[PDB]
Amino acid sequence: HLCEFIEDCEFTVLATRILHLLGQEGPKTNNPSKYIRFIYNRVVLEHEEVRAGAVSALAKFGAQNEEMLPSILVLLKRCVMDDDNEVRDRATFYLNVLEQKQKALNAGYILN
């Protein structure tokens, strides 16, 4: 309900809060395809900023992986990628950051 409605019940501000929370929660509650499905959408919206949250939430999530995620988790960041300079940069950088640590290690430091 939240997901859907909020989508078409708007307000960016809400998203900030919820994002943050969601950010922690991920794969302890599974339903991956859906959740992904959502996540993509959330990003769908413009705003470098709106887009950005899906990646950040993801870090706790990614790290944990779910009912299918690690392989693919690795595949995805690749599949979804962006320019728009500082938006480019965000993709690049997260990557670059990613680039910079053994992704397993990477996850551990950053997450905390």
Added chain:
Amino acid sequence: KEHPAHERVLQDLVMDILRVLSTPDLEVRKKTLQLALDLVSSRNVEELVIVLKKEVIKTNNVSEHEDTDKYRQLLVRTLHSCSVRFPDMAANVIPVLMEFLSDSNEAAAADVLEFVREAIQRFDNLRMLIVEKMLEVFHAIKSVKIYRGALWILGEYCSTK
């Protein structure tokens, strides 16, 4: 124009004609600009450029742009193209300056466009000055646009360690 035997001169006479444009009507003007761009094998250029600069001054003036603004953007496009081909010069520096003066996004977008481009183009030298120029501009200024500007530039970085 498909008199592709296309004589030198003719291209050249344009400016004269173009002068008339100062008695505006953008829409007409606009048609001109496209038209204009074409002839230049990166030449009859300077005289023009100069003239452009004249335009530029003219553009300053006191203005109450409403139509001409548009023109400016266009001009810049028209202008942009040339440069690609060309080796260009001080004139260009001036845009940079000019741009600093200005206050609306579309230009920033162009600028940015330039950011991109230039990032590709790198013969560099100019940039550095400009970067300086910019440094001034920057010091000299505040805004989201700027704020954004900083970001990329910052991103860019080099010397004066």
